[PDB]
């Protein structure tokens, strides 16, 4: 037998970043699996040039993910902060560069709130996902 | 203890 | 004029008050935080790595005071805010900050605001602030 | 700035000015601008809109807005025609420290010469009490 | 032959309201015909959507069934680009729910290729009861 | 022509 | 910044 | 009135 301390916020965060950006490249059509009924997703200010509202739950998020046409998504992660927050959650701030559809790497930040899934030990879901490119602003 | 994993809670409605 | 609160209004009002206080009375900033609050404001350690977060009002008071905020000027270019776990508000901020009348430095920041437990009163549970130049540079 | 940010900032500035100096509200409007602020005519029919700064000023001064208090419950704003912004507002307006009255309002804001400057092309305001009551 | 003036904003607005709320009751699956590629639609957690396709999806989501409407008042004013801005104040019952007060804001633009043809550039709906308290 | 409605 | 006023 | 301050 072997007992260790609960995974740290930083371990949960770093493992989350590894799986999230891998899936974005490899199977963006499977990213929706990370989210639950009450999850919010926000990816940039503008979509066809129109202001994009937050969407909620797996289906609307799957749709929003599919609409962004993630193809050949290359990510360079430069820094990850992950801290304990409300309700045994983890707040993550990612700083990195992202290329979609062979466009040039652009600086971004991404804010996530991760929450315990509730039924499986060390399992989390994404409650909040907020992406912004720096150039945007 | 199982390793760190990710996914939404069970929803048989959706 | 009174406005019915929303997460976005809470977040923009918060960012205004925080950066006003950082300019006018940085020595009072620590009063936004509680015992379990996290705080980092960029910096590189003697090893060239990103500075560690500190926890709780006493450490945060020490850390803020150690930053020597003098005539701090901020240009906020992006604020977004969403409801999160336990009636919290997660806030994403991007902008420029000039300290001690030096050059403006781009930053990427995440707050988690939590109900203080006084209606529509919030404290800062988490303050993640990084300068782009120490991460991307 | 997003349509919502333009719309929310406009609504705060409008209802602030209606309290501090309603005699200066006309400054938001142009020669083709429309304005109505509830009211019932001598036949009991909702009052007509008026057009242009002169008549808008006359109509505003007619309201005798005094110490008005405003509760903004809802603001929605979309991009519209010609880089304008259409704003939907619901809230409560108290005049001369009488009871708060529910209102339903639409603005069309349009680019003014100066960057991120807007004027009010249309101001449609109705009190619920005169329409449903 | 007979030529008449341009229809007034209020004649376009009243005719729009008649056709729109009739179609909401009779065939909500045909409402998408009123919109263009650049149109915005929100039936106020609701996200705004753009174009006939996404608007059709949102309208079909609302499962409009046995929709009864009482229109209490229409405002319709000329706006930007030969458009009409419309504010509706009414009561709406969906799926045999109790009548609830609403407003709806529309911007109607000329369709371009036909005289006196308009489409819906902007459609913003909100129930009162979910805003006041 | 009477007042009519439809996308372009 | 965002400003408001009628055209000249 | 929205206000800010620690526990």
Numbering used by the authors:
A (entry chain D): 0 to 46, 48 to 137
B (entry chain H): 12 to 25
C (entry chain A): 2 to 118, 120 to 139
D (entry chain B): 6 to 117, 119 to 139
E (entry chain C): 0 to 43, 51 to 139
F (entry chain G): 13 to 20
G (entry chain F): 14 to 21
H (entry chain E): 14 to 20
Anything the authors wrote about it?
G3BP1/2 are paralogous proteins that promote stress granule formation in response to cellular stresses, including viral infection. G3BP1/2 are paralogous proteins that share a domain architecture consisting of an N-terminal NTF2-like (NTF2L) domain that underlies protein homodimerization, two intrinsically disordered regions in the center of the protein (IDR1 and IDR2), and a C-terminal RNA-binding domain composed of a folded RNA recognition motif in tandem with an arginine-glycine-rich IDR3. The NTF2L domain harbors the binding site for several types of proteins, including host proteins that regulate SG assembly (e.g., caprin 157 and USP1058) and viral proteins (e.g., non-structural protein 3 [nsP3] of alphaviruses). Most of these interactions occur in a mutually exclusive manner via a common binding pocket in G3BP1/2 NTF2L.
